[PDB]
Each structure stands twice: as C-alpha cells, then as structure tokens.
Amino acid sequence: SIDPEKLRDQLLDAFENKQNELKSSKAYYDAERRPDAIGLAVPLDMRKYLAHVGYPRTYVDAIAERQELEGFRIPSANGEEPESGGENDPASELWDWWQANNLDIEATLGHTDALIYGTAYITISMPDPEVDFDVDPEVPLIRVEPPTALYAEVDPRTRKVLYAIRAIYGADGNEIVSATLYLPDTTMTWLRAEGEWEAPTSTPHGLEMVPVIPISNRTRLSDLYGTSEISPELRSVTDAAAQILMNMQGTANLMAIPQRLIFGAKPEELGINAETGQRMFDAYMARILAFEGGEGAHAEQFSAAELRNFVDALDALDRKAASYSGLPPQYLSSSSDNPASAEAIKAAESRLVKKVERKNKIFGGAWEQAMRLAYKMVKGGDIPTEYYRMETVWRDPSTPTYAAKADAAAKLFANGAGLIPRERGWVDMGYTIVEREQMRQWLEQDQKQG
Amino acid sequence: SIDPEKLRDQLLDAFENKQNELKSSKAYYDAERRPDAIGLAVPLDMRKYLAHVGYPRTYVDAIAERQELEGFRIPSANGEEPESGGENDPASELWDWWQANNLDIEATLGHTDALIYGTAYITISMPDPEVDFDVDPEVPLIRVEPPTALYAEVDPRTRKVLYAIRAIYGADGNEIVSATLYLPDTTMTWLRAEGEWEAPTSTPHGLEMVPVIPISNRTRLSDLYGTSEISPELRSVTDAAAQILMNMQGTANLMAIPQRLIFGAKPEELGINAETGQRMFDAYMARILAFEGGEGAHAEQFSAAELRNFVDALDALDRKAASYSGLPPQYLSSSSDNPASAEAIKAAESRLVKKVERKNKIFGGAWEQAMRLAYKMVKGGDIPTEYYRMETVWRDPSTPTYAAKADAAAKLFANGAGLIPRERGWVDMGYTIVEREQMRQWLEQDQKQG
C-alpha cells in the first residue's frame, strides 16, 4: 500500500528519534561526562578532573565473555537416528553457514550491543558479486547490525516486524551516505545523502516476512522491545561512586595536610615583602624559627581531612555494586577473599552463571529464528516441520575446572563397565559438537591399533 | 577514476590528521608527562619531580603477552576428514608461510599496537628480489605495520578498505622518506629523493581487493572502527593515582617532620647574626639549650603531616585499577591473600583469561583474511571454498599448571581402556598442532621398537 519513497522518509525520522535514547546507555559503557557523576564539593576550576567508574563495562563484559554458541541440534525423523555423514545431519548445514559467515565473531560481538542498548538485529540475505568478493556464493549472507544503524517496527498485536530501515552515516560525520529498506515482498537501497538520493537499487525475496530478526534483552513479558542490561540500580551506584572519587581526589589536593597559622605576629615584624605578601625562609630539616613576642603571639593549625572517611564509603559502594550485579566478589574486589577449591568457585560464581544461562536461553530464540529464515531463503521450499523444534547448544558459562570433572567422568564410565555410555562422558567433560564428532574418528582409528 | 598522484596527497593529509589523535593514547602507555597527572599541592618549582603510573602499560602487556597463535585449522574435503593427511595440506601451507615470515615474532608486536592505538594493519605482497632482501622468494611477503605508519580508508556499506597509504619518516624532523599507495588492482611507491618525489613505480596484482587488512580492537558492533584498549576508566585512575604520588612525595620533602618554633625571645638575645638572620649551635645528642626569655616566652611546634593519609588513598585507587582492568589482584599487589591451589589460580585469573579469549577470536578474524588474500596472491586462482570456513587455533591463555592436568588426562585415557582416544589426551594436555605431529612420529618409533 504505502509508497517505499515515503516509508524511507518516515522510518529515517523514527530511527533518528531512537538515537536520543541510546546515547544515555552509551554514556555508562563508555565513560563520557555525566552531570550526575561530578563530585559537588570540588571547586569549579578543579571540576575538569573527572573520575570514571567501570562497573557498567565490567558487568556487560562479565556476561558477554561467558556466552559462546557450540552448535545447533534438530529432532530426527521417525526411527530416531541422531546424526549421519555423506548424507549430512541437517543441523550441520546450519553450523556450516555459522562458520562461513564468521558469526562466531559477529554474534558474540553483537551480543554486547544487545546488552548495552537492549536490542540488536540479525539481517538475512543472499550474496551477489556486485557488492563483495570474500564470501562463499552458495551460503546465505547473515549479518548482525546495531540499533545505532538499524531500526525495525514491531506489531504489538502479533510480535512480528512490519518493516525495517538500515541507515549508515559516512566519514565520521552526519551525512546519511546510504539507506536500505526491508519489506515482506522486497528490499530497496539508496546510495547518497538525504535530499540527494540515487535511484532505488532493489530486489524481491521469497519470504512472507521481513528478513530482519531482533535479538532483544527482554527480561519479562511486557518489555516488548527489550531493555538495557545496565539497570537504574547499577547506574545510580556508578554515579554515586564517581562523586566520592572526585571529592576524595579534590581533598587529596587542597586538604589532606595541616594548614599552619601564626596569630599576633606583625607582617613587617616577620619581614613580609610589601609588594608580594610573602617572606621566604630556608626550610631544611631541623631549623628552629625564633619570633618576637607579637603582644602574646602563638602558632596553631587546621587539621588535615582524613581520606579514610571517603574510602570507608567507597568500600560500601563496592558492596552495593557487587550485590546489584551478582558478579563474584573478587571481580569488584569487595573483599580480600578468593575461592580455595572447585566447589568454592561454583558457589561464588553461581549468580553470574545463572544470569548467563538465562541470556543464552533468550538470545538462542533469535538465532534459531534467523536460521529458519536463512534455510527458507536458500532452499526456497517450505520449512521441514522438525526445524520448528531446533535447539541452540551453548558452552557451560562456568569456569572450566578440568581435573574435578576428569576424575568424576572416569569413575562414572569405569572402562565401559560403569553407569554411563561413552559419549555421555564426552559431553559431561564439555567437548563441543565438532570435537565429539572428531573424537568418533580418532576412536575408530585407535580401535585399529595394537 | 581519481589520479593516484593526487590521491596520495589527500591520504597523506588524512594520515597526519589521524596522527594527532593517536598520540593521546600513546602518552598513557609510554608514561609521558600529562597536565592531569601533576599533583596540585606541590609548589611550582618542585612540580618538576613528576611521578609516573604504570597501570595502562601493565594492563596492555598482561593482555598482549597471554596471546599466541599455534596453527590454522581448515575443514577437510568430504568422506575422509583427518587433521592432516601425513602429507602437504591446507593447514601446513598457511603455517609454513607464518613461520617463513617470522609472524610468530612480529604478530605479538602488532597485537600490542592494536591494543594501544585500537588498530594495526596486515599487508600482503610477493617479494621483489631486486631489492636484495634476505627472504625465501617462494612464500608471500606478509607483514604487519602500525597506525603511526600506515592508514587505510574503509567502506561503511560492506566494511572493505577502499585504498591505503603507507608513509615512512627519516627522523623527528617529520620529513617523509617514502610513501606507498595501495589500490584495489595495484600498489604504487614514491621516494622523496631530494625535497620532492621521484616518479613512482607501480606493481599490479590479481586480487579484487586492497592487500591491506585492518586488525582492529572492535569491542562492540557500534564501534564501526576499532578503539584503544586503555579505556577512560584506566586513564582517569592512572592520572588520579599520579596526583596522590606527587602530593605524597612533596609532603615527604616539606612536612614529614615537625616544624619547631620559639616565641617571645629577641633575635639579638639569642645572638642571631643580623647580616644573615641565622645562628649556628652544636646539635649533638642530649645537650640542653637554656634561654633567658621570660616575656611569656615558650617553645611550640607545628605537627608533621601523616604520610599514611595519602597511602590510605593510594590503596583505594589500586583496588579501582584492579576492578576496572580485571587483572588478578596480585598484579596490583592489592590482596593480603595469594592463591596456592590450581583451582584458586583458575578462580583468580578467570576475568583475565576470558578477556584474552575474547581478543583471540577478534584478532583471529583478521588473520584468516590475511591468509586468504595471501593464498590468492600466490596461487593466482580463486580460493578453494573450504578456506571461507577456516579457524585460527590459539594456545590457552591460562597459567598452565601441568601436574594437575597430567593427574586428569592419565585417568581419562586409562592405558587405552578409558573414556577418550589418545590424541584427545594430547589436545587436553595442551601440546600444539606442531608438537602433536612430532609425537605421532615418536609414537610410531616407540610402537615399532616394542
């Protein structure tokens, strides 16, 4: 119905309006100047010496470091045969496209934008040799694109995308040097700045749906568009701690030392120079100053401020930042304690592990959906019914304690007489789908040795 | 389209514009003087005694020295799919070029500058023996160059380099000795023979793409181009700690001792030499001074400054430097504990280890491109479709704890009756791609000898 020329112009307006929200979350992950971070006690000329607090970056890194996809799996046809070669396992096609795109860089990279901004988009397409030279022509060209360069409109009635715009600025400026529109029928692209456009380079595609899938950091039902992981709790302790670091630093300049005073001595009796208000005197160690009586003069001093009075509040905000984030206490350094044993580690990181397992559960939904669109685009025919029941398989988020699992798996398997089959011991040791498959071949070769 | 003789001068202007930014990040790693590091309480003449803080250098080195590439892995042709054929293969040719170029030396330098500045560049060509180089003429000349010497302009639409300029300076006089331009179908080079350029020498190439690959430190997708590893968190803590060290040192020179005063005594009564304002007295141990003074005459003193008032702020900033960097608390000397089990090491290193594993895939994604362009440079034909699916294999960045792995891999293998094939036990023990092949030969000799 609506003209693509008019859809482009309204979607670029909506995309530009979103950039007023995203600049807020960016300014916590990159420590840009926040008015609320400036410590109030330091005088106006010293306020150029900003302090910065790394809690938001530390929290988003400590999630995104743990997330890694290790395969897909799909229910087999009747007869239950789990894998095959020559005539391939259908899940190994999806992993071939994952490797051929380098999504093992781009997805784990784009998951940080999904945590920072609350959303990021997966774009599905076929390659064409007019644009690029270093992709396999048989493989669907899948990319991840951030909300600072793509926008999509979602129908709250049915949760699908209606249409989306991908809009890219040039030369570190604000010239919108290209824009692309996605529709259920088609996509169009323009190749110069706004008010100066080329003709729309355009193509059809075979889907009933827009080839843009949102990865979204949704935490509940409601929450339809996803929400930033850097929560108001973690923002408010980051801003609070930055003020304490500025006031402590300001105190270390003006006031972490006594101020010495003399009362009753006349400036001309001390020999103060009239033009400058100063008297120089030699100040090597053990000199004794001797003064005239000054009509009952005496010396006294203002106290130093004790900097511990700020540090014993900084250690309280390092208990809050740990408590809100659920990181291990040694990540914030909230105390001088470290896990002594494998069970002490699994205890200490239990919050961060269950946080990451829930992020793997949520972001896995976007990746299986993007793989269904990629199959439906490449293979052209309607989707085989088992692809509606596929699973993403992810690495165990916990720290890789090897020896504690090695003696456990050896006790369970007991040289083949034990409780579990061989390949169960391999997945309990945490070997990936591609490593387990490779070990079936080395094991078959070892069964020929003597 | 554009004249190369004019394109050179446009890119040399853009390169010297970039050099104005890079020196900001360099000043923190080289520990050069910064205005923000100068502690404000120190008197103007005494401010020459700069204190330099090593957190940025400690962080960037602790990341860069944990990385090491150990081979390239390419998926083998279907139906017989080993790690190697006992013969020349895709993994071995790319590793032979890696060794023949000494990239196992020079990539560790390139990864340091890629962390300091946020980028470096990998360049590819065939060697020209007319230059009298000491290199094997059969291998491609693959070599890395820093952003202080090579600059490349990049396409926002598909992220490829359009063109790049390399410029070489003779001395701190900032005169260019040579410039080199890389274009999609040729290189070109000029020498500044006497104040001005000689006529250029071109060299064409068979690639559709510029033979310069940016190895860049992209932490997030909304970084369209790579950013410095020395984050604003670490800059602001490095400068904060330098001000405390300056003020503490000036306090030790001026106030770590009390200042001694006498009031109500005439200078001429004490016998001050009026020409110099001073009086020597014998200051040997236990002698008692006696004064006539009775005009309310008394001794008194200003206190010392407590130097620990600053040290109590130094260790607070060291806990922030540890918290923002994610190094083991040992590296900032900040813990009272020190880990003493192989499990407690895996606990304390965990946030450094998974930060290095994040860099390994981000930099690995650039090294595979340099190897695909090098293959197309040497073999001339378009690349075999398996090379789009290659993986860089990196040595594990954790502290190695050999005995705790030998106790585990031996129990899993159980003299061949156990859970895993022999070569998996070698991969888990951490023997590299090259060491595993050498062991297959020793194992055959041991098996033949009996």
Tab-separated table of C-alpha atoms in Angstrom, chain A residues 29-389:
chain	number	residue	atom	x	y	z
A	29	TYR	CA	29.522	1.773	28.969
A	30	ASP	CA	31.862	4.453	27.555
A	31	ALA	CA	32.659	6.822	30.462
A	32	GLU	CA	31.548	10.070	28.797
A	33	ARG	CA	30.950	13.088	31.118
A	34	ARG	CA	27.693	12.734	33.127
A	35	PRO	CA	26.445	15.799	35.113
A	36	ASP	CA	25.316	13.453	37.935
A	37	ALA	CA	28.858	11.945	38.217
A	38	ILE	CA	30.564	15.290	39.089
A	39	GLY	CA	31.501	15.484	42.806
A	40	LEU	CA	29.889	18.637	44.231
A	41	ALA	CA	32.491	19.683	46.852
A	42	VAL	CA	35.413	20.347	44.439
A	43	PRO	CA	35.732	23.997	43.226
A	44	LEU	CA	34.706	24.969	39.673
A	45	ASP	CA	38.253	25.001	38.189
A	46	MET	CA	39.103	21.527	39.633
A	47	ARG	CA	35.829	20.052	38.173
A	48	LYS	CA	37.750	19.404	34.891
A	49	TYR	CA	39.359	16.399	36.697
A	50	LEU	CA	36.520	13.898	36.151
A	51	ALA	CA	36.593	10.489	37.845
A	52	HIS	CA	35.148	7.495	35.918
A	53	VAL	CA	33.634	4.243	37.279
A	54	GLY	CA	33.996	0.955	35.392
A	55	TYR	CA	31.064	-1.014	36.939
A	56	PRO	CA	28.792	-0.933	33.791
A	57	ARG	CA	31.619	-2.005	31.429
A	58	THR	CA	32.725	-4.664	33.963
A	59	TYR	CA	29.185	-6.099	34.191
A	60	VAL	CA	28.493	-6.213	30.408
A	61	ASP	CA	31.956	-7.753	29.748
A	62	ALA	CA	31.462	-10.345	32.520
A	63	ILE	CA	28.260	-11.573	30.755
A	64	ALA	CA	29.408	-11.345	27.102
A	65	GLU	CA	32.758	-13.117	27.821
A	66	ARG	CA	30.820	-16.244	29.008
A	67	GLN	CA	28.384	-16.560	26.043
A	68	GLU	CA	29.573	-18.901	23.244
A	69	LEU	CA	27.453	-20.985	20.829
A	70	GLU	CA	28.864	-24.523	20.189
A	71	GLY	CA	26.213	-25.940	17.799
A	72	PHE	CA	22.582	-26.480	16.782
A	73	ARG	CA	20.526	-29.699	17.160
A	74	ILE	CA	17.272	-30.708	15.410
A	75	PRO	CA	14.882	-33.636	16.222
A	76	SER	CA	15.428	-36.549	13.799
A	77	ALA	CA	12.772	-38.232	11.613
A	78	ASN	CA	10.870	-41.335	12.871
A	79	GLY	CA	13.475	-44.074	13.605
A	80	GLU	CA	15.449	-41.646	15.857
A	81	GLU	CA	18.912	-41.799	14.100
A	82	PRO	CA	20.728	-38.758	15.663
A	83	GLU	CA	23.463	-37.982	13.028
A	84	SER	CA	24.700	-39.044	9.530
A	85	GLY	CA	27.608	-38.369	7.082
A	86	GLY	CA	27.802	-38.096	3.263
A	87	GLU	CA	24.029	-37.675	3.524
A	88	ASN	CA	24.549	-34.997	6.228
A	89	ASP	CA	22.946	-34.271	9.624
A	90	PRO	CA	20.505	-31.337	8.925
A	91	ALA	CA	21.901	-29.377	11.928
A	92	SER	CA	25.455	-29.463	10.425
A	93	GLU	CA	24.209	-27.315	7.479
A	94	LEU	CA	23.255	-24.525	9.939
A	95	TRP	CA	26.686	-24.769	11.604
A	96	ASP	CA	28.420	-24.619	8.185
A	97	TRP	CA	26.639	-21.287	7.481
A	98	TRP	CA	27.540	-20.068	11.019
A	99	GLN	CA	31.252	-20.727	10.352
A	100	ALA	CA	31.206	-19.493	6.706
A	101	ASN	CA	29.788	-16.100	7.876
A	102	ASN	CA	32.179	-15.838	10.904
A	103	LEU	CA	29.130	-15.453	13.206
A	104	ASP	CA	31.454	-16.872	15.925
A	105	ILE	CA	32.962	-13.334	15.789
A	106	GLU	CA	29.914	-11.221	14.820
A	107	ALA	CA	27.291	-12.783	17.159
A	108	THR	CA	29.433	-12.696	20.352
A	109	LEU	CA	30.407	-9.130	19.346
A	110	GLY	CA	26.755	-8.072	18.668
A	111	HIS	CA	25.580	-9.575	21.997
A	112	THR	CA	27.398	-6.661	23.753
A	113	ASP	CA	25.237	-4.136	21.800
A	114	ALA	CA	22.162	-6.261	22.676
A	115	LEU	CA	23.102	-5.987	26.410
A	116	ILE	CA	24.091	-2.243	26.260
A	117	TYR	CA	21.165	-0.864	24.167
A	118	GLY	CA	18.622	-3.638	24.938
A	119	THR	CA	18.331	-4.760	21.257
A	120	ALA	CA	20.370	-5.663	18.119
A	121	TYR	CA	19.266	-7.039	14.713
A	122	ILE	CA	20.152	-10.092	12.571
A	123	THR	CA	19.913	-9.353	8.818
A	124	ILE	CA	19.472	-12.307	6.390
A	125	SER	CA	20.240	-12.080	2.622
A	126	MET	CA	21.715	-13.893	-0.403
A	127	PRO	CA	25.178	-12.708	-1.598
A	128	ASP	CA	25.607	-11.045	-5.028
A	129	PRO	CA	29.018	-10.462	-6.747
A	130	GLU	CA	28.336	-6.736	-7.433
A	131	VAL	CA	28.924	-5.822	-3.722
A	132	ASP	CA	31.644	-8.110	-2.199
A	133	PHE	CA	34.386	-10.638	-3.097
A	134	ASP	CA	35.240	-12.701	0.064
A	135	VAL	CA	32.053	-14.745	0.812
A	136	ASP	CA	31.004	-18.217	-0.416
A	137	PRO	CA	28.265	-17.625	-3.104
A	138	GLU	CA	26.331	-20.793	-2.024
A	139	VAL	CA	25.933	-19.583	1.630
A	140	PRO	CA	23.295	-17.101	2.937
A	141	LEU	CA	24.928	-13.773	3.837
A	142	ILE	CA	23.862	-13.270	7.506
A	143	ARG	CA	24.967	-10.120	9.461
A	144	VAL	CA	24.398	-8.607	12.918
A	145	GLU	CA	23.658	-4.847	12.936
A	146	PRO	CA	23.333	-2.497	15.971
A	147	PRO	CA	20.386	-0.171	16.854
A	148	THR	CA	22.724	2.794	16.094
A	149	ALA	CA	22.480	1.740	12.373
A	150	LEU	CA	19.177	-0.242	12.017
A	151	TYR	CA	15.554	0.251	13.166
A	152	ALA	CA	12.563	-2.113	12.951
A	153	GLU	CA	8.840	-1.570	13.689
A	154	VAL	CA	7.125	-4.449	15.621
A	155	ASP	CA	3.328	-5.012	15.641
A	156	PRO	CA	2.293	-5.345	19.349
A	157	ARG	CA	-0.769	-7.425	18.161
A	158	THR	CA	1.383	-10.286	16.731
A	159	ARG	CA	5.083	-9.642	17.742
A	160	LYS	CA	6.439	-9.770	14.099
A	161	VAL	CA	8.364	-6.928	12.345
A	162	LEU	CA	6.281	-4.937	9.767
A	163	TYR	CA	9.278	-3.263	8.050
A	164	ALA	CA	12.819	-2.083	8.883
A	165	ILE	CA	15.427	0.511	7.784
A	166	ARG	CA	19.254	0.115	7.840
A	167	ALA	CA	20.861	3.545	7.755
A	168	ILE	CA	24.643	4.188	7.618
A	169	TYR	CA	26.457	7.516	8.092
A	170	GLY	CA	29.743	8.351	6.271
A	171	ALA	CA	33.153	9.928	7.034
A	172	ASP	CA	32.649	10.150	10.881
A	173	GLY	CA	30.032	12.936	10.228
A	174	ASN	CA	26.203	13.038	9.912
A	175	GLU	CA	25.803	12.564	6.113
A	176	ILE	CA	23.472	9.515	5.723
A	177	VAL	CA	25.536	8.146	2.769
A	178	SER	CA	23.309	5.047	2.306
A	179	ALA	CA	19.941	3.678	3.465
A	180	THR	CA	18.223	0.284	2.908
A	181	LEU	CA	14.505	-0.564	3.375
A	182	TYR	CA	13.233	-4.104	4.139
A	183	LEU	CA	9.638	-5.156	3.336
A	184	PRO	CA	7.871	-8.585	3.348
A	185	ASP	CA	7.983	-8.553	-0.515
A	186	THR	CA	11.319	-6.883	-1.258
A	187	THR	CA	14.282	-4.690	-0.276
A	188	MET	CA	15.394	-1.289	-1.702
A	189	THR	CA	18.716	0.600	-1.265
A	190	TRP	CA	19.711	4.240	-1.926
A	191	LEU	CA	23.371	5.301	-2.364
A	192	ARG	CA	23.757	9.046	-1.464
A	193	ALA	CA	22.806	11.532	1.314
A	194	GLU	CA	19.248	12.676	2.243
A	195	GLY	CA	17.695	15.164	-0.247
A	196	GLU	CA	20.335	13.939	-2.799
A	197	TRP	CA	19.336	10.236	-3.305
A	198	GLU	CA	20.226	7.931	-6.234
A	199	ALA	CA	17.576	5.625	-7.809
A	200	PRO	CA	16.468	2.664	-5.551
A	201	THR	CA	18.629	-0.422	-6.277
A	202	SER	CA	16.050	-3.115	-5.413
A	203	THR	CA	15.318	-6.895	-5.273
A	204	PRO	CA	12.435	-9.309	-4.450
A	205	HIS	CA	12.776	-12.145	-1.879
A	206	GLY	CA	10.817	-15.388	-1.310
A	207	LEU	CA	9.710	-14.981	2.364
A	208	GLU	CA	6.248	-13.986	3.705
A	209	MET	CA	8.198	-11.965	6.380
A	210	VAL	CA	10.850	-9.219	6.810
A	211	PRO	CA	14.452	-10.661	6.702
A	212	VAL	CA	15.354	-8.803	9.976
A	213	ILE	CA	15.218	-10.674	13.338
A	214	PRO	CA	15.643	-8.722	16.641
A	215	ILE	CA	17.955	-10.107	19.335
A	216	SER	CA	16.297	-8.385	22.350
A	217	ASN	CA	17.307	-8.330	26.037
A	218	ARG	CA	13.664	-8.796	27.229
A	219	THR	CA	13.517	-9.612	30.969
A	220	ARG	CA	9.721	-10.258	31.372
A	221	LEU	CA	6.574	-10.439	29.296
A	222	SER	CA	5.644	-6.802	28.631
A	223	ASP	CA	9.161	-5.349	27.856
A	224	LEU	CA	8.316	-5.863	24.158
A	225	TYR	CA	11.258	-4.006	22.555
A	226	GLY	CA	13.872	-5.231	25.129
A	227	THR	CA	15.647	-3.196	27.876
A	228	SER	CA	19.281	-2.162	28.585
A	229	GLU	CA	21.194	-4.533	30.908
A	230	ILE	CA	22.829	-1.513	32.662
A	231	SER	CA	19.889	-1.162	35.120
A	232	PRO	CA	18.957	2.086	37.028
A	233	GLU	CA	20.317	0.396	40.193
A	234	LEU	CA	23.759	-0.082	38.590
A	235	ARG	CA	23.623	3.442	37.027
A	236	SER	CA	22.885	5.079	40.402
A	237	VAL	CA	25.777	3.302	42.236
A	238	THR	CA	28.122	4.145	39.294
A	239	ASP	CA	27.205	7.862	39.523
A	240	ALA	CA	27.373	7.775	43.354
A	241	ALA	CA	30.879	6.213	43.404
A	242	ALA	CA	32.168	8.698	40.776
A	243	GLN	CA	31.219	11.623	43.066
A	244	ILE	CA	33.080	10.017	46.024
A	245	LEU	CA	36.227	9.514	43.861
A	246	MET	CA	36.162	13.203	42.774
A	247	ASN	CA	35.615	14.536	46.336
A	248	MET	CA	38.393	12.229	47.686
A	249	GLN	CA	40.802	13.357	44.924
A	250	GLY	CA	39.906	17.034	45.469
A	251	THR	CA	40.587	16.583	49.214
A	252	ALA	CA	43.969	14.975	48.449
A	253	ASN	CA	44.903	18.232	46.625
A	254	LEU	CA	43.592	21.020	48.916
A	255	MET	CA	43.310	19.466	52.369
A	256	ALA	CA	44.952	16.047	53.105
A	257	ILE	CA	47.606	18.040	55.106
A	258	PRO	CA	47.577	20.532	58.038
A	259	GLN	CA	47.312	24.262	57.291
A	260	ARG	CA	49.802	26.118	59.544
A	261	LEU	CA	48.913	29.553	61.052
A	262	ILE	CA	50.517	32.220	63.314
A	263	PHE	CA	48.430	34.783	65.257
A	264	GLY	CA	49.733	38.092	66.696
A	265	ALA	CA	52.989	38.469	64.711
A	266	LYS	CA	53.028	41.716	62.604
A	267	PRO	CA	53.717	41.227	58.824
A	268	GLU	CA	56.524	43.897	58.991
A	269	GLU	CA	57.949	42.226	62.170
A	270	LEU	CA	58.185	38.896	60.265
A	271	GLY	CA	59.678	40.888	57.329
A	272	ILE	CA	56.933	40.113	54.741
A	273	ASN	CA	57.745	41.862	51.439
A	274	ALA	CA	55.072	44.563	50.853
A	275	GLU	CA	54.765	44.069	47.032
A	276	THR	CA	54.142	40.258	47.209
A	277	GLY	CA	52.826	39.444	50.744
A	278	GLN	CA	55.458	36.648	51.144
A	279	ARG	CA	58.548	36.014	53.316
A	280	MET	CA	60.906	33.298	52.019
A	281	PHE	CA	62.780	31.235	54.658
A	282	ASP	CA	65.152	28.233	54.414
A	283	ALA	CA	63.279	25.030	55.341
A	284	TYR	CA	65.853	22.207	55.719
A	285	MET	CA	65.040	19.628	58.448
A	286	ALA	CA	65.913	20.772	61.973
A	287	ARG	CA	65.903	24.636	61.827
A	288	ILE	CA	64.165	26.367	64.772
A	289	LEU	CA	62.239	29.555	63.917
A	290	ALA	CA	62.511	32.238	66.639
A	291	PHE	CA	59.970	35.101	66.851
A	292	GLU	CA	59.392	38.377	68.653
A	293	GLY	CA	56.634	38.204	71.324
A	294	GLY	CA	53.906	39.672	68.999
A	295	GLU	CA	51.961	41.061	72.033
A	296	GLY	CA	51.291	37.410	73.122
A	297	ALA	CA	51.550	35.658	69.712
A	298	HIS	CA	51.069	31.886	69.207
A	299	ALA	CA	51.139	29.215	66.470
A	300	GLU	CA	48.221	26.882	65.619
A	301	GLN	CA	46.936	24.796	62.681
A	302	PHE	CA	43.799	23.472	60.991
A	303	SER	CA	43.540	19.649	60.856
A	304	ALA	CA	44.109	17.545	57.771
A	305	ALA	CA	40.983	15.826	56.437
A	306	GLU	CA	41.371	12.024	56.850
A	307	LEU	CA	40.951	10.456	53.359
A	308	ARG	CA	39.765	7.189	55.026
A	309	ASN	CA	36.413	8.987	55.601
A	310	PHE	CA	35.781	8.676	51.818
A	311	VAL	CA	37.463	5.257	51.380
A	312	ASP	CA	35.206	3.669	54.049
A	313	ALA	CA	32.241	4.866	51.907
A	314	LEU	CA	33.886	3.660	48.630
A	315	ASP	CA	34.095	0.123	50.083
A	316	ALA	CA	30.333	0.339	50.872
A	317	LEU	CA	29.502	1.234	47.235
A	318	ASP	CA	31.797	-1.667	46.137
A	319	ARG	CA	29.469	-3.913	48.259
A	320	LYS	CA	26.379	-2.391	46.546
A	321	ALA	CA	27.820	-2.694	43.004
A	322	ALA	CA	28.636	-6.390	43.691
A	323	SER	CA	25.193	-7.023	45.322
A	324	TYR	CA	23.215	-5.473	42.408
A	325	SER	CA	25.304	-7.061	39.595
A	326	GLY	CA	25.722	-10.606	41.011
A	327	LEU	CA	29.380	-10.790	39.903
A	328	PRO	CA	31.810	-12.826	42.071
A	329	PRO	CA	33.058	-10.553	44.929
A	330	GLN	CA	36.662	-10.725	43.603
A	331	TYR	CA	35.535	-9.003	40.329
A	332	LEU	CA	34.754	-5.731	42.216
A	333	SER	CA	37.450	-6.629	44.856
A	334	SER	CA	34.759	-6.086	47.576
A	335	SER	CA	36.956	-8.183	49.969
A	336	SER	CA	40.407	-9.917	50.043
A	337	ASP	CA	38.909	-13.444	49.662
A	338	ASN	CA	39.313	-15.962	46.782
A	339	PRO	CA	37.835	-19.478	46.167
A	340	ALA	CA	40.265	-22.145	47.504
A	341	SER	CA	38.688	-25.186	45.701
A	342	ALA	CA	36.449	-26.193	42.748
A	343	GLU	CA	33.247	-26.232	44.896
A	344	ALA	CA	34.100	-22.778	46.343
A	345	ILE	CA	34.284	-21.451	42.737
A	346	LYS	CA	30.877	-22.939	41.728
A	347	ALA	CA	29.420	-21.372	44.890
A	348	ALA	CA	30.959	-17.903	44.320
A	349	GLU	CA	30.020	-17.536	40.597
A	350	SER	CA	26.549	-19.213	40.883
A	351	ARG	CA	24.681	-15.877	40.279
A	352	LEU	CA	26.763	-14.941	37.211
A	353	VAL	CA	26.388	-18.494	35.769
A	354	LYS	CA	22.557	-18.496	36.134
A	355	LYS	CA	22.407	-14.935	34.656
A	356	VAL	CA	24.393	-16.111	31.588
A	357	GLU	CA	22.361	-19.349	31.217
A	358	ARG	CA	19.207	-17.138	31.062
A	359	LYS	CA	20.854	-14.850	28.422
A	360	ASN	CA	21.762	-17.972	26.376
A	361	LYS	CA	18.094	-19.121	26.670
A	362	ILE	CA	16.791	-15.711	25.445
A	363	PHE	CA	19.323	-14.978	22.617
A	364	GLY	CA	19.032	-18.609	21.384
A	365	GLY	CA	15.428	-17.796	20.309
A	366	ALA	CA	16.597	-15.084	17.874
A	367	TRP	CA	19.339	-17.332	16.417
A	368	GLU	CA	17.065	-20.336	15.720
A	369	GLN	CA	14.572	-17.949	14.038
A	370	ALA	CA	17.303	-16.353	11.867
A	371	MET	CA	18.441	-19.883	10.854
A	372	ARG	CA	14.839	-20.809	9.834
A	373	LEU	CA	14.657	-17.643	7.662
A	374	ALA	CA	18.113	-18.439	6.176
A	375	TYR	CA	17.005	-22.005	5.264
A	376	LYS	CA	13.639	-20.763	3.866
A	377	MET	CA	15.508	-18.165	1.726
A	378	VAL	CA	18.314	-20.502	0.446
A	379	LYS	CA	16.388	-23.770	-0.069
A	380	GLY	CA	13.279	-21.905	-1.396
A	381	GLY	CA	10.701	-24.571	-0.371
A	382	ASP	CA	8.555	-24.538	2.796
A	383	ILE	CA	10.302	-25.371	6.130
A	384	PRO	CA	10.635	-29.076	7.203
A	385	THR	CA	8.435	-29.463	10.325
A	386	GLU	CA	11.329	-30.560	12.639
A	387	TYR	CA	13.046	-27.112	12.257
A	388	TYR	CA	10.264	-25.624	14.471
A	389	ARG	CA	11.780	-27.740	17.348
